[model samples]
Target chain A: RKIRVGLIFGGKSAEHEVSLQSARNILDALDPQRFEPVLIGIDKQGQWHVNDPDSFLLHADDPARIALHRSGRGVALLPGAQQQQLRPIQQALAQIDVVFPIVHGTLGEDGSLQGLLRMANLPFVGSGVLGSAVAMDKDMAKRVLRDARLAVAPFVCFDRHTAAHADVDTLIAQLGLPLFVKPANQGSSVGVSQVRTADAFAAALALALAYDHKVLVEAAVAGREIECAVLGNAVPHASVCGEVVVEIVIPADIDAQTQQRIQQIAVQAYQALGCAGMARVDVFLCADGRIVINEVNTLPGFTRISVYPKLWQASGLDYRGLITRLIELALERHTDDQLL
Target chain B: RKIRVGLIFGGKSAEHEVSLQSARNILDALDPQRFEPVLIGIDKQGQWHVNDPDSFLLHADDPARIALHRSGRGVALLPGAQQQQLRPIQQALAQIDVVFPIVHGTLGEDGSLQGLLRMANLPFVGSGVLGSAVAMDKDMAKRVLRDARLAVAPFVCFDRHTAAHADVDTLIAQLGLPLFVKPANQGSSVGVSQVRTADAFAAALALALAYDHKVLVEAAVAGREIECAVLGNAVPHASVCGEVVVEIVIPADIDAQTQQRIQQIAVQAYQALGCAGMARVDVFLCADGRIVINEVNTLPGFTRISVYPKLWQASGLDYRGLITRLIELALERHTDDQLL
Candidate 1:
């Protein structure tokens, strides 16, 4: 029997449309002989619906206006310990051998959904709870990376009440001007602001506090922004780096020395977070040649033109092959960790 | 008019009976006027069943053979965004205003249930995803604490395949003999051993690897083990430290300077892990007066005579009052994190 892959999409984040687009692409790439795709779509109001796999996307052509077709039945997964629950209709609802969580941001890529899948005993194609949670928090992720002796931008974190007692001068003194303020718990750069002056720190901190209780203030590091993909659970493999000039250029134009350094740092950062299955590591390469790890996106975008799959393709793995590898990785990781 | 509180117990852990006992105590101490109890007992195989709060325990008087009464109906939660699903019977079948997750380990306190509750939009009593996850992994928690500048036991961690290539002489060189070996992710000292000789290293590492893929080998430090209770979400308050001497001695015998230091370190470790609601910070006080953090139990045992509630009881908070405060903390923490 072919492995059942539950493709969950459409979340409560601003990237709700983007998730639907990604899910559609993933469904198209699933090998018919090896895997069968099941569609579960979560609405903007946070309600989950089981959709028809063939007709799940509402606007297939338009990236800005794409939506999940919610005419399917509402699903409430009853995560059981054994296989005697349901076989056919229940599989359509919440039952699956594996989950390809295409949803990104908020309840999507965050640890909450990963936790839900873990409880359901379903192997998923991405980082588990620890990696997902740490990577979601900018401050926490940086601390973990720094502890691993990797280069991360200098930062200080505090909560809303602490922000009240926070002195702008102390922060500015610690982190030089042109600093960055971000809500530590948010995904997809929802609450991020660049502060060039001391006065802007107040509004920046306030904007961050609006989204999350904890805020991260950091010294903005200058370097070329490049994203690389890291895959596998035990011994991870990093994809060729991609640079953005409004277009993704694979095997980013860099010396062999810098390329190896970027690849090494990306994998280390991923390992430091205890990430498994897959993650897209975004990094900054300074002009002086020091590579600094920026953020590890546990669930990177997978639209037709998305950089995640593009880098992998340039690394010699096709879209369909990458999907198969991710599912296989999820199964193997679960096997290694499962208690006898 | 009482707020419904679901008391979850009987998880898939070695501490299964301990959880059953803890649930009984929580039910007895819950203020009937302000809160009503709902019992959801998970079996050893991880099947969920709704039980009557009045008589859920089978061997009530015997702690050794205490069991969850399976006379109640099997429950499968249908977590939806609205309240129209079920009211009277539904509350027993996974519906509740708040969750008191007394289930101690594995799926219980290890962020999986926290994720399930978060996805359900139900507030729970204890640390959320990040804290529970980070706290569960020993290596991850120590890294976080060390990064926070808190003194954690000197240790090095690696997985199974790497352990194959690991040289015992090098490990002994780094961490002195009589070193500790632990499965980085297990709970309740399941697979922990101390190696006093080089010959004992192989067996110790093997035992730890059986429980988890990753292993932590550390230098065993001689010290008095003291556990302190930390409460609250944003600005946490640490309780009086306690020492074990057959009975949990409250206000552990120590100098005033040491007392203050223990409290400060406990709160810092809790904050570093991003713990909320409650956590029991386990530490070691060495001969030279060096304070070393041991572990943070996110959901410490509350089986009527557990160290967690006792420490709080010694420091002015009663058992019933602690439960109410934890519930309040969960509500406030969830409020601050919920997106618009």
Candidate 2:
């Protein structure tokens, strides 16, 4: 009996198109001998839909431009794990053994989907509610990391209240020029702005705040962006560090010592945030010779060439093996959770 | 033109009866002219039910012995806030202006419900996903509060991995006798044990670990248990301090200076955890002259005379005013959230 993997993706996020592309790879990578795909598509408006794996995505062109097709019956997952009941046409779909949610940003990575999955009693991949929630907020993640004595980029957080009285000069004094303004909970660099001047600060804050009520302004790090993949629930193993050169280079071009340090820091951040299953820990290797955390993506992009999987690929785990491990991790976590 | 407030209560938690009791008071307190109640009940098995307010309970005697009736249609909330669709029996429920979730513990208070509410696009009462999720875990809350430079009881956290090697004698030396063993994520003192001796430590840990994978063992605080009610989204206001002397004592029997200190600490703890709408900030007025936070209840109990609202009542915001304030706060937070 093959494990029924609920490939839940495509949602009300800015990265909706990317999710369809990500889901395609995960569905294809699933080892058919041990796993079967259950396509669960969520529309941009937050409605869940059932889809045939063969015709799950449309556009047939650019992977970046692909969109989820609304080509099947409407569905709503039940609160119970053993049964799944659908609506509109009243269909009784078989139960899913595990859920692999690839929906990124907003409701997805932000613990919203994790919470939904937990309430439904379904085993799902990646971090639980607490981990997913904290990792989604840049401000919360920095605070937890700093509290754990982990090095993180210097940043200041401001919500809608403090944001109203935000003075660019004051922020610049706190964090020097060429700072970054980011929506604390957004993904894919959606509303991130790099302010090089006082005139651009207001617009940057406005754009960032438009995506999330809370915004984080950080001093820019002049360093190499390193992405390290970490997998596990209790005892995590770190993958080879990869350089995000605007290009993904596995086994980051760095000395063995630096790679070790980066890997250590990544695992530390992952555990500090209580992340389970997996995460792509992104950090900056500063010119001043220090590794400062950028952010931890609880559910990073899953394209075969994406840094998360590519880093693991170079670290001895292929795409199929990585997916299989993640699925197993999800099952392991659920089993462990039930012991509590 | 009355505001339709979704009174969603009854849940899969140890505090189901308490939730029903809390929901009763909230429904009774809703100002008829301004608000209309839409009763949504969640059974012990986590099924949502449409209920008639008149016959919601099964017990006519003890409030603690009360049970939810299977007297109405089964309902499943749609992802959209404007409409709700039911299953088995097709029923169309009208849109709710806001959701006042009185369900406490687990799926209700632990960000699970908050996440589901957010994904449903419903402007529900209390803290959002991040705040609810973090505050649910004792270990996570302690880390965040300690990082904020707030005083908290000295505690050691251990998950299943670390727990296997836990030496009871070492823990005893770290935290003196009369220590507390608690399941880090449980509520209502469900899996909490007091270890007065090393002989009882192992059993205590077992009981605590049975409820949660992570357990926190903390040094007992020789102090007065003070509970303060904090309200608002951004600029949070603290209520008059109350004491849990086995009995709820409003305007805690302490000097105005101590009251001010407790209120300040309470508000700081509230802001530190990024709490919103309302939270019952519980802390200890330690005998050593320092105030240490116990834990924050993002969704506290709300019978007519519960500590959370009673404390607010002592601060001049009576039960109805408190309910109205909370509803207005939920709407305000959703409004502020919409700007993001």
Candidate 3:
């Protein structure tokens, strides 16, 4: 029998369109002989609709062009002990063997959805509640990575309350110029700004604080952007590293020694954060060969062009194989947890 | 019109019974003039029931004695943009203005319910997603606190895979005897064992691993158990210190200087964790007068005998007034966050 996978996508996030595209790619890549896909789309208004997998389609030319049918059915999965009570708002549906949450950003990737899935006793791809929550908060993620002795760019965090009394001059002096200000809890750089002068700092802070109460300001590292993918539960494996020029992958020009070091550090950071299944570790390779970690994404974009799968594909795993491997990993983690 | 307060209780956790009693006390102490209580009982089976407050009662003599009527309507809350769609399973119910989550462990205090509440865009008492998730994981909590330069017990964490290849003798040499072996993500004393001999280590590890995949072994501190209550967001107030004798509180017999030091440390720890509304900071006062933070409980037990409210009661606020204050803090924090 084919395993039933509940493919959750289209969340109430700024990256809502990207999530739909990612879900389309995942559905196309999934092995139909081995898995049956169940489409559950969360609208921008936050209502969940269980879409018919066969009827859902993405425009081939435009990745973001997609539509969710309201006529499919409305549903809600209530928390359960043995299994999640996946009931239709007006009827009933089949049980889901596992969940592949393709939704990204905000409530989707910020641990809220993961928490709901955990409460429902469902096995899902990617990190658990703690890992997802920590990774979502940029300030907390840097603190955790730094605590593990991982090199990260020096940053200062303040809330809306503390911002009123904060020493802006001291912050600029310590972190230097060309700083990046961001909302600690956002994804996809929604409330992010590059502050070139001290005069622009307050406006940048205000913009960040508009999206989240906590704001993080960090000194920009002059380096090539590098990303690595880590997978598994107990002893995770890291994929071959990839360098990004404009959010598009290119072969990293670093030596074999630095490449191995980056991969090892990425996997170590993933394990230290208690991350399970997968994560995309974004880092900086400085001119002097010093690597400084920037952030970790528990749920990175998974479109055909996204760096996570591209890194793995560059490492020899095909897109279809990657999807199958992730599901297998989810089931394996769930079984191991049951033994606990 | 009185504010409709959704008093959530009873959960799918080891401390399910304790939560029922805690909810009963909260209901009894809540001032009727200021709030209209809506009892929501989550059964051990993980089903949500809109409980009739009048029919739910705790037996006078027993701490865990409680009965919840199943006759009351079933319900499920769907996440919404403006407000949560709290719909009945078969009918309809009134909207909840705010939520007071009295459920004490597992799916409740561990950030799962908090995530659901966040997804629904509802204001709730205690910590938010990151704080609750971090506090629930003992290893992560200790790591974050240690990074903040707070004193915690010397410990090492290992998952099932690591535990298989771990050097037990080396761990014993490093942490010493009378060590505590605990599941990384549990509340109360569930799946916790004190290991004094090398022979008992395996069984303790097994017991701890049964409850959670990650297990922590810590050197036992020979110190008085001290706890303090913290309330509010941004500028949080710390209540007078209380000492726990087997999880039951008493007036701390420490000196005035020590008392002030503990309270200050407790509040600092609370803020460091980014907790809002309320938290109970558990610490150890050593023989040398050094304060070592053990852990922080975002939603500490709220029973009449629970230390969280009792600390505030000892500090001039009555139980009824404490409930009122917590709800107000929730509302206030929500308002401040909206400004962001």
Per-residue CA lDDT of candidate 1, range B45-89, in tens? 787777777778887888777887876465554444555221222
Error of 1 at B112 (Å): 0.8
lDDT of 2 at A190: 83
**Native-to-model Cα distance after best TM-score fit, residue A75 in candidate 2, in Å:** 1.7
lDDT per residue for candidate 3 within B57-111, as digits (tens), equals 5453565566555554776666543544566777666788889997765778878
Sort by TM-score, best first. Answer: 1, 2, 3
Q: Per-residue CA lDDT of candidate 2, range B1-340, in tens? A: 7998888888877888878888888988889889988888888777777777888878825875689876556656454333553232455665678899877657787898788778667788899988998888889999999999998889999877788798888888888898898988976488789988889988888888888888999999988998889999888899989888968787789989999988889888988898899999888887777999999989888887688888887898889888898899999888777655
Candidate 3 structure, TM-score to reference: 0.95
Roughly what TM-score does model 1 have, to 2 decimal places? 0.96
Candidate 1, DockQ to 2 decimals? 0.69
Range of the 10 consecutive residues with the lowest summed lDDT in candidate 2 chain A: A79-88
Q: In order, how many clashes per candidate?
A: 0, 2, 0
Query: For every candidate, how close is chain A to the native chain A in TM-score?
Result: 0.94, 0.95, 0.95
Best by TM-score: 1
